[PDB]
């Protein structure tokens, strides 16, 4: 959560880390000014982008299951170590020997 706090000001940069407190909107107009190198006249006229950014994050809210790995990678991890731990320990005991 302090990392989400430092998203805006640290994403500026101008050095990591000796900075800052800049609002998140202006952080995405400079982060957007940077590599999507659309300069200031497009982000001025217009924004909403904001509704497209929020629309993007909205579909990022709705979509976890099931066809959206990364998420199947996450349950591949929890099912990985839970499988190894509990299921391999269930093979180890009951039964192995002669």
């Amino acid at each position: 959560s302090s990392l989400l706090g430092s998203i805006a000001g640290v994403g500026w940069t101008a050095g990591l880390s000796s900075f800052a407190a800049i609002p998140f909107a202006q952080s995405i107009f400079y982060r957007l000014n940077g590599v999507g190198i659309t300069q200031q006249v497009l982000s001025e006229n217009q924004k909403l982008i904001a509704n497209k950014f929020n629309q993007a994050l909205g579909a990022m809210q709705t979509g976890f299951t099931t066809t959206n790995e990364a998420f199947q990678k996450v349950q591949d991890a929890v099912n990985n170590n839970a499988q190894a731990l509990s299921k391999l320990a269930s093979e180890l005991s009951n039964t192995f020997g002669a």
């Binding site: 990392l3 590599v35 659309t38 993007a56 994050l57």
Partner: protein, 111 residues
Amino acid sequence: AQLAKDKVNECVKAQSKRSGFCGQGTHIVSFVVNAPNGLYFMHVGYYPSNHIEVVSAYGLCDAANPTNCIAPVNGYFIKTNNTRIVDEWSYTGSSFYAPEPITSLNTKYVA
């Protein structure tokens, strides 16, 4: 985990002007949330999707020959010489969209 530290120090603090790792598109923001056993990223990338083929140069010259092109994206279109480049289009007369390098071939505009 050392990769995740490399993804937090690059993609999360800075932007990071590099491709995937910061997945699929010119990266913009990225967010970190703790997942089970790991981190989890919500990389907010750009996705162009409506491509319009326009024409360059490569720059300009006149009777005298100092040039333009580019700060930082190309061209210098036609109609007439306009410059919103990556991603959308198109700007006005340049005035801050122009370093002034040496002239090149295909003289006077300036390829």
